[PDB]
Ligand binder design. Structure first.
Ligand SMILES: *[C@H](C)[C@H]1/C(=C/c2[nH]c(/C=C3N=C(/C=C4\NC(=O)C(CC)=C4C)C(C)=C\3CCC(=O)O)c(CCC(=O)O)c2C)NC(=O)[C@@H]1C
Ligand SMILES: *[C@H](C)[C@H]1/C(=C/c2[nH]c(/C=C3N=C(/C=C4\NC(=O)C(CC)=C4C)C(C)=C\3CCC(=O)O)c(CCC(=O)O)c2C)NC(=O)[C@@H]1C
Ligand SMILES: *[C@H](C)[C@H]1/C(=C/c2[nH]c(/C=C3N=C(/C=C4\NC(=O)C(CC)=C4C)C(C)=C\3CCC(=O)O)c(CCC(=O)O)c2C)NC(=O)[C@@H]1C
Ligand SMILES: CCC1=C(C)/C(=C/C2=NC(=C\c3[nH]c(/C=C4\NC(=O)[C@H](C)[C@H]4CC)c(C)c3CCC(=O)O)/C(CCC(=O)O)=C2C)NC1=O
Ligand SMILES: CCC1=C(C)/C(=C/C2=NC(=C\c3[nH]c(/C=C4\NC(=O)[C@H](C)[C@H]4CC)c(C)c3CCC(=O)O)/C(CCC(=O)O)=C2C)NC1=O
Ligand SMILES: CCC1=C(C)/C(=C/C2=NC(=C\c3[nH]c(/C=C4\NC(=O)[C@H](C)[C@H]4CC)c(C)c3CCC(=O)O)/C(CCC(=O)O)=C2C)NC1=O
Ligand SMILES: CCC1=C(C)/C(=C/C2=NC(=C\c3[nH]c(/C=C4\NC(=O)[C@H](C)[C@H]4CC)c(C)c3CCC(=O)O)/C(CCC(=O)O)=C2C)NC1=O
Ligand SMILES: CCC1=C(C)/C(=C/C2=NC(=C\c3[nH]c(/C=C4\NC(=O)[C@H](C)[C@H]4CC)c(C)c3CCC(=O)O)/C(CCC(=O)O)=C2C)NC1=O
Ligand SMILES: CCC1=C(C)/C(=C/C2=NC(=C\c3[nH]c(/C=C4\NC(=O)[C@H](C)[C@H]4CC)c(C)c3CCC(=O)O)/C(CCC(=O)O)=C2C)NC1=O
Ligand SMILES: CCC1=C(C)/C(=C/C2=NC(=C\c3[nH]c(/C=C4\NC(=O)[C@H](C)[C@H]4CC)c(C)c3CCC(=O)O)/C(CCC(=O)O)=C2C)NC1=O
Ligand SMILES: CCC1=C(C)/C(=C/C2=NC(=C\c3[nH]c(/C=C4\NC(=O)[C@H](C)[C@H]4CC)c(C)c3CCC(=O)O)/C(CCC(=O)O)=C2C)NC1=O
Lengths: 197, 172, 162, 162, 172, 172, 162, 162, 172
């Protein structure tokens, strides 16, 4: 293949060292390294669903039943479960098909690496990783990324990182806010005949 | 996020001063109506599914273009997402009621939700109308005199009404 | 900031569910502790100036080298004594904030975060502030539930520095 | 499960911290309402047989088609009536478990997780179980601290079925 | 995880039976002992750094062959990891004391810890000795009559001793 | 990124031609400058903690409103973050001095720092003044004539000063 | 882009630390090799026209079918010979840029990455460019540290093509 | 541990590539500093006992309270002075290790990582070790490249302690 | 991970002693041999593709069982993996030659290589034979007199041969 085109990092809160006690506005570690009850495993699976699919696509049709069953049996790690959520049909249709490669790179970087994209250049750099290697190649690149590892490793549900600074009511906007599709797919659905009154 | 205590702590630390007697008496008053606060949270939590279902039903009764083919709530999936949005907004109003401060509501629910509903094509006026219908449903449920110890509860009802109006104004 | 109420919500938020009776019992414990915390903070606010001066004098008593050796980090001159009195004032004020909040959250987001690199790049011994907190734990005069819940913050900052 | 003690420990473990005064207040509210939860669970245990029989009769009164139409999912025969009584006994026993435990954790591990696939697979309407839980609400006889603690679990199972 | 209530709840659900009156009376006795349990948790938490520091000092005094060079607690990184391990084990003992059951201690701390120590070459007998020093420090601090209302607290002390013995037995 | 060698290499590839004799003579002059450049990098690295501490102390002496309550350097978290910002800016100034080109300083440090400081409420003028105080501190460390071989080092000192003003202009 | 200074700064930034004496030794090795690299770059610069013409002649001698058989990928006509000479000049120029840069970074960013897709798409045998780089190795006339540094870049492009 | 050879091999493994001329130049800089590092480590080894005793004594002159105040963390007894001399021997020995290896990797893996927990847990002030390493800076007795390499390790430990 | 100096550093620190004069003189002799070490690394790196291709051709001429269908090196995916393993083993032998110690080779290449080859059904003796062919090619290329200044290089070549033998023994 080809090496990724270089992009400059833009200063974000996750780049600097965190001088905080976790406390109130810490994202809870959903980890399988400690032995869990089936209830706690269910909340961990729901946390992975809430991170990848958001709250809206937590419906029964979007539940990956065999992936959940293999994850309970520890056939796969948390990272492989996150990969299976990203490789899910529902994720591909709802999120990937309704977006271009740029906004899908932004969505996947936010929902897997836990940080925003630095600029449009990072979206440009990983969009050709999408365009050549498919969605599986791109997700695999993101999940094998040292960033994903040094932050979440193999056995932790990813979370938005450093969303809010200590003693701040408000920080960066939450990743949940980002929609399945942008305004381009909105106006394309408006043009095909939807959403009118 | 802040609550009714940590907010006042935050302005005190911004000014770099200890709390006065009046601030501690106001916080003791919030402790005094804390029991009615927990009752309000318990009642909305217990009737959350009924509130979401009834308010969605009334909203799509008055606004039939959402359930008409082509509408923003026009599928099983989009209706499930709209009911999930109702549940989420109700959940964050209960979080703000529990804390006594809407910092969690403004932080994790409301900031950026208007641009999200614009980018989706979600009609924010219809979401504001549904949130308002949740406001009358939740306020009628909270103010129920049956099966509870009687007392004045207009402060916590007005606080819930303010949280609901702030949630409706964030999407309208 | 870390506080029963905020923590209860954070748990219900991460699991994406409403505030159950678990969360309501968390609020009940917050309510039964909050009046003792508010009266403890009122007493510490009243006794604040004497406690800060006595704690600074106790630190100067156990560590006299701070009052005789020249340096930026020491209290040999008037500016060092002013910075030290401001430091115990900050400590006691954030302890009162923890009393009012009902959790260690004001200490976590106001003082405990990054105190170690502050103490090492300005060459401040944490044992000075530990002995100041020992004076606050010895001379605050509270009794009952106000005593133990105030001391839990003082030993929390002691265990953070040590 | 989800109880104040277990959730406080899991939260403090995830943030990698000791049990501060926040978790102590969590256990304080747990102790404050644990006695009422235990005696409510005992009252429901003693009145359980009459509660399950009355709830089954109330469901058959609201939904008579269950007791007159042929089907595996219906209670027309004696086997279906035994299944419905066993189901309402399951619901009430998990309510007593939640009253003992102090949270909806016994419901989340024993009843809530997987009830939708059962209700859609074995063709059981959740509104029947909702009506049974409403009868348990209307006829448990608890007052004050026990009534609001019990009806929290009754309503949590109602909102999970609706 | 489990606490003292959900252990009995899980046993009753495995039996499929309502809790008997002996179990309700035992849990009511646990509620009665709960204030002493919270005092024990608070005292060990408030003296955690002193417990870890004094236990490490006494451990590497009576076993000085680990801080000498070539030892397992030699170097800053290794010694910081040893102090952190003492703090972690003490923290999970406080967790198990708080819950009234050793489920969180056995499942999130003691599970695989002996395997981890024999994989890293950490001498688990020395860690067990340090756990006994944190044991004697914590049971001395908990049983201190000063600054607390006098009462019988031997069951909580024996339960903390049981958790410390479980921690010591699971590292070697 | 680029250094003093690869910047000229990239510009020569942009023109698509071999390096002329004047460019190679200038790069040989950089080779003659390289030992003094390594000395300047080593001196700022060896006195980095003193430079950050003294620059912060003089900055908060000149600007006392930052450490007053309500200020941006107020509380321990923001104070440690401010000292970390000084250490990071000094670290990438040493990186740019080491390379001989400020590609790493613009791309990996100063990219997006100004609007980040705008969004957090960080006063960029005070950060610029702190970077200036770091600049005279590092120039006093570099141009110390004791303990080093005598020679003219005006070009490397001017390059360090230009890198420091380039860092300071990116936040003001 | 691999250069001793850029890789040292990248390593120090990836670990987030200052430039210790290790990166100083990296810069010292760069600085020691730099004079030989610049002299080698100057010699290849002012001998480059003869080197490129001779390398094209050596490729046409070893592979005469490039000059005889028709095709867009072959040098049978004038434009194929001009494109072959321009490609060999590109190879030699990026080798000189590697000599100035003191690492294989210009080769990676400019010539090595994606050369398999170019050779695949336009049907160019890499053995032609390998023979051209062997001609550059055989007759660039350098000795000592300048020869060993220049031949390392020529072998790096040979290793990437073979 | 972090040496120029280890950083070069780890980098070439990080891009998964052979050792280009960049890593060779890293090795040449390591070789050209390694001789002076070896006589620097030899001179520090020969002067080790005098330097450790003088550094401990200089700590006792700048900080006399360490020899006067009774405590576990102070050198008032013979046990505390033995611990201090052992610590300064550890510092100087790891400095000689850094001189032998050619980088601060021995300092990182043996001394620098985790030293913050060491000074907070056992109540040791880092200013004592800063003064002792300043004494080692004062009269280690090296000149030229050995002086600049050894002091860079002494400043690396000083900046990590401050 | 160690090099030729770092191994002696780790052994001396595990003994807790300064390096003796014999160890310093041995490392000085290693620094003297370092130029020949760099020459050996440069020659094997510059002829790596020739070594891998010729060693593969000699291996599959000696062992045609691998390239016939039903064999391990049959098909382009498995043969591409085989040539990748040849260049990976050659790369880590060059890494070990560069460092002067085999810690990178036994820790970063041969870690789990035999378990991988047995689990895959890869013939480890065939990989060992290919490693011996790379050894013969590399000690032919390094010992070439032409193009380099003369000298005695018995020790570095014996060290390279020891690296190749411990690469072949770790897969056999
Ligand atoms: C029903 C006939 C019987 C029964 C079943 C039962 N199964 C489980 C748990 C698991 N079953 C599986 C099997 C699979 N998961 C997969 O992905 C696939 C192929 C794609 C298979 C074949 C797994 C992995 C589990 C564990 C993970 C999970 O829980 O989902 C249980 C739960 C046991 C428990 O207590 O945890 C049960 C009850 N039980 C019966 O009694 C019937 C005979
Ligand atoms: C007193 C017990 C001893 C003493 C103290 C001393 N402290 C400083 C400087 C600082 N102290 C802090 C601490 C805080 N800042 C905060 O925002 C908070 C949370 C609200 C805390 C706890 C900080 C940030 C500084 C440095 C910045 C500043 O000057 O304000 C000094 C001055 C050090 C200097 O170099 O200028 C001194 C002397 N000194 C003693 O001798 C006493 C024993
Ligand atoms: C001397 C300058 C002053 C002094 C020192 C003192 N140090 C300790 C205890 C420890 N020192 C270390 C340091 C290291 N251990 C390492 O493995 C390494 C890397 C090789 C270093 C740098 C450690 C780990 C300890 C504690 C464990 C132990 O006791 O060995 C003490 C004792 C503290 C105690 O509470 O027992 C003392 C007194 N004290 C002074 O007054 C001098 C000014
Ligand atoms: C690696 C390049 C890079 C840098 C440098 C950077 C800077 C940076 N400084 C921050 C905050 C900060 N920056 C400062 C700095 C100062 N306050 C003052 O009053 C002084 C004028 C000044 C120091 C001289 C402070 C106090 C904060 C705290 C923000 C807050 O918590 O409110 C934050 C928010 C994230 C966090 O604090 O965890 C970032 C990202 N981000 C990057 O990616
Ligand atoms: C936690 C705070 C928060 C909220 C609440 C939020 C809302 C939210 N509502 C969405 C969709 C939606 N929201 C609605 C809601 C409605 N549609 C209607 O017609 C009604 C007016 C209304 C019901 C009241 C619908 C129907 C969708 C589906 C849009 C779609 O998927 O096509 C989406 C995108 C769905 C996705 O990405 O999978 C978000 C993020 N985002 C946040 O961060
Ligand atoms: C864990 C489940 C649980 C809950 C939630 C709970 C709440 C609770 N609400 C109380 C009081 C109360 N609750 C209300 C609330 C109201 N009064 C009204 O007429 C309005 C309709 C309504 C506002 C929604 C009032 C007025 C009091 C008495 C004042 C007070 O105690 O604060 C009390 C004091 C004891 C009592 O008198 O009953 C408790 C314990 N106890 C429990 O065990
Ligand atoms: C949030 C911080 C906080 C805590 C932790 C707390 C604990 C607490 N411990 C109590 C009692 C007690 N604590 C003990 C404990 C002991 N007695 C002994 O002599 C032994 C040395 C020791 C065992 C470690 C006993 C015996 C009681 C009285 C019996 C009981 O209330 O359960 C009480 C009842 C009120 C009182 O009489 O003081 C409280 C509130 N209150 C607070 O506000
Ligand atoms: C690994 C640690 C290390 C370093 C950093 C190092 C640097 C270093 N700096 C040198 C020279 C030098 N350094 C300077 C620098 C200066 N002269 C001044 O008066 C100014 C105050 C100052 C500018 C900051 C000069 C002028 C020379 C001699 C000219 C030259 O060699 O380039 C030399 C040549 C040998 C010598 O004469 O000392 C070396 C080796 N050697 C090492 O082993
Ligand atoms: C089943 C999938 C598969 C393919 C495709 C495959 C190809 C393949 N062809 C090879 C060699 C070869 N292929 C040729 C082919 C030719 N030489 C010419 O002049 C002709 C124009 C041309 C025929 C069209 C030659 C000469 C070699 C030997 C190369 C050598 O020994 O150096 C080799 C080297 C190993 C060996 O000697 O067997 C492989 C792996 N192997 C596979 O397992
Ligand atoms: C950490 C360093 C490292 C090592 C040590 C490594 C070895 C390695 N060799 C592999 C496969 C392989 N290796 C060979 C090698 C051979 N088959 C033969 O017949 C010959 C005897 C021999 C070459 C001389 C083959 C054929 C496969 C593929 C086996 C298969 O596809 O089933 C695989 C399986 C994954 C893959 O194909 O990429 C690994 C991990 N990979 C690494 O990154
Ligand atoms: C960046 C690329 C680069 C490299 C790799 C390099 C290596 C290099 N090898 C050298 C010496 C040498 N190299 C050898 C090596 C050998 N002699 C033999 O006859 C054997 C065939 C062979 C072992 C493989 C010897 C014996 C010396 C002289 C002794 C010594 O300098 O150590 C020298 C000293 C200068 C000289 O006399 O040529 C250098 C600079 N210089 C560079 O610029």
């Amino acid at each position: 293949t080809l090496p990724l085109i270089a992009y400059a990092p833009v200063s974000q809160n996750q780049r600097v060292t965190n001088y905080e006690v976790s406390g109130d506005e810490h994202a809870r570690i959903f980890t399988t390294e400690g032995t869990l009850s089936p209830s706690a495993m269910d909340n961990l699976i729901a946390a992975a669903y809430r991170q990848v699919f958001n709250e809206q696509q937590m419906i029964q049709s979007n539940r990956q039943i065999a992936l959940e069953s293999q994850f309970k049996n520890q056939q796969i790690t948390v990272r492989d479960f996150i990969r299976g959520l990203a490789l899910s049909d529902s994720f591909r249709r709802r999120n990937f098909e309704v977006n271009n490669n740029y906004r899908f790179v932004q969505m996947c970087i936010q929902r897997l690496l836990g940080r925003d994209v630095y600029s449009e250049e990072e979206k440009i750099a990983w969009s050709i990783v999408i365009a050549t290697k498919g969605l599986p190649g791109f997700i695999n690149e993101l999940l094998n990324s040292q960033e994903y590892l040094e932050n979440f490793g193999y056995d932790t549900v990813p979370y938005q990182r450093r969303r809010i600074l200590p003693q701040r009511i408000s920080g960066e906007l939450p990743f949940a806010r980002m929609p399945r599709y942008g305004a381009d797919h909105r106006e394309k659905l408006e043009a095909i005949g939807y959403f009118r009154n | 996020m802040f609550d009714v205590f940590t907010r006042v702590v935050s302005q005190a630390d911004a000014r770099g001063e200890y709390l006065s007697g009046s601030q501690l008496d106001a916080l003791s008053a919030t402790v005094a109506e804390g029991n009615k606060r927990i009752d309000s949270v318990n009642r909305i939590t217990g009737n959350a599914s009924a509130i979401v279902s009834n308010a969605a039903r009334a909203l799509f009764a008055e606004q039939p273009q959402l359930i008409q083919p082509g509408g923003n709530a026009y599928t099983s999936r989009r209706m499930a997402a709209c009911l999930r949005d109702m549940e989420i907004i109700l959940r964050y109003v209960t979080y703000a009621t529990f804390t006594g401060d809407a910092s969690v509501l403004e932080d994790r629910c409301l900031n950026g939700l208007r641009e999200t509903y614009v980018a989706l094509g979600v009609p924010g006026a219809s979401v504001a109308a549904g949130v308002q219908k949740m406001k009358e449903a939740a306020l009628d449920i909270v103010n129920d005199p049956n099966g509870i110890t009687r007392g004045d509860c207009s402060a916590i009802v007005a606080e819930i009404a303010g949280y609901f109006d702030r949630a409706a104004a964030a999407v309208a | 900031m870390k506080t029963p109420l905020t923590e209860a919500v954070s748990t219900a938020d991460s699991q994406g569910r409403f505030l159950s009776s678990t969360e309501l019992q968390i609020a009940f414990g917050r309510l039964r502790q909050a009046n003792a915390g508010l009266q403890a903070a009122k007493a510490l606010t009243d006794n604040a100036q004497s406690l800060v001066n006595g704690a600074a004098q106790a630190v100067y008593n156990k560590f006299p080298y701070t009052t005789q050796t020249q340096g930026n980090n020491f209290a040999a001159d008037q500016r060092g004594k002013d910075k030290c009195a401001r430091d115990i004032g900050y400590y006691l004020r954030i302890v009162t904030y923890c009393l009012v909040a009902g959790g260690t959250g004001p200490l976590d987001e106001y003082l405990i975060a990054g105190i170690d690199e502050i103490n090492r790049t300005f060459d401040l011994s944490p044992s000075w502030y530990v002995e100041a907190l020992k004076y606050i734990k010895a001379n605050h005069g509270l009794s009952g539930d106000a005593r133990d819940e105030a001391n839990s913050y003082l030993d929390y900052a002691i265990n953070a520095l040590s």
